[PDB]
Amino acid sequence: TRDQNGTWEMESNENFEGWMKALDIDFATRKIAVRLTQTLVIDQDGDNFKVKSTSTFWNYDVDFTVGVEFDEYTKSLDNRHVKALVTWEGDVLVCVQKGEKENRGWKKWIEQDKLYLELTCGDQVCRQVFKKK
Ligand SMILES: *C/C=C(\C)c1ccc(-c2ccc(N(C)C)cc2)s1
């Protein structure tokens, strides 16, 4: 399925610190953030997505349209400018963020009835699983 709507609560998190390190996130921020459970809220209507990543320590919101490139500031993550594009490869939603970092973006799919996320930067991959309603 391509339908990713829901409130998604983290069940599993692997190599989140490696991913943050590859983004050069400072030591203090990484050490706190790696401890935390996360929620991902996805509102999806056709190509239009509104996504909210939250924990006790951050809020990172982004809206995008599948197939439409957008210039993006990554704000309180790593304060960088990238050129972002989100597209479908089958039922895997793929984001590529062009800029300073290589292999930066994510892949997201519903293989379960859970949400799977791969966050990538450089040679680092973080893998997460969330459970929905
Ligand atoms: C569709 C999935 C998106 C937009 C994201 C998944 C995780 C994200 C994220 C994780 C961690 C942070 N910080 C500030 C540690 C920000 C965003 S966005």
Author numbering: 1 to 133
Q: What is the paper's account of this structure, in its own sentences?
A:
Human cellular retinol binding protein II (hCRBPII) was used as a protein engineering platform to rationally regulate absorptive and emissive properties of a covalently bound fluorogenic dye. We demonstrate the binding of a thio-dapoxyl analog via formation of a protonated imine between an active site lysine residue and the chromophore’s aldehyde. Previously, we showed the utility of human cellular retinol-binding protein II (hCRBPII) mutants as a fluorophoric tag, wherein an active site lysine residue (Q108K) reacts with synthetic aldehydic chromophores, giving rise to the formation of either an imine (Schiff base, SB) or an iminium (protonated SB, PSB). Q108K functions as the active-site lysine and forms a Schiff base with the aldehyde, whereas the K40L mutation is assumed to eliminate interactions between Q108K and Lys40, an interaction that could otherwise impede imine formation, and is also required to promote Schiff base protonation.
A conserved water network connecting the hydroxyl group of Tyr19 and the thiophene sulfur atom of TD-1V was observed in the M11 crystal structure. This observation marked Tyr19 as a residue for exchange into one that could disrupt this organized water network. Although incorporation of the Y19W mutation with R58H did not alter the spectroscopic characteristics of the protein/fluorophore complex (M13), surprisingly, when coupled with R58W, it led to a 30 and 22 nm red-shift in absorption and emission, respectively (M11 vs M14). Gratifyingly, the crystal structure of M14/TD-1V was obtained and showed that substitution of tryptophan for Tyr19 did indeed disrupt the water network observed in the M11/TD-1V crystal structure. The explanation for why only the combination of Y19W with R58W led to the significant change in spectral shift as opposed to the combination of R58H and Y19W is probably due to the nearly 90° rotation of the chromophore trajectory enforced by its interaction with Trp58 for M11. Exactly the same orientation is seen in the M14/TD-1V crystal structure, confirming the key and exclusive role Trp58 plays in causing the rotation of TD-1V in the binding pocket. For example, neither R58W nor Y19W are individual “winners”, but together they lead to a substantial effect. With the changes thus far, M14/TD-1V complex exhibits a bathochromic shift in absorption and emission (Δabs = 73 nm, Δem = 45 nm) relative to its parent mutant complex (M1/TD-1V).
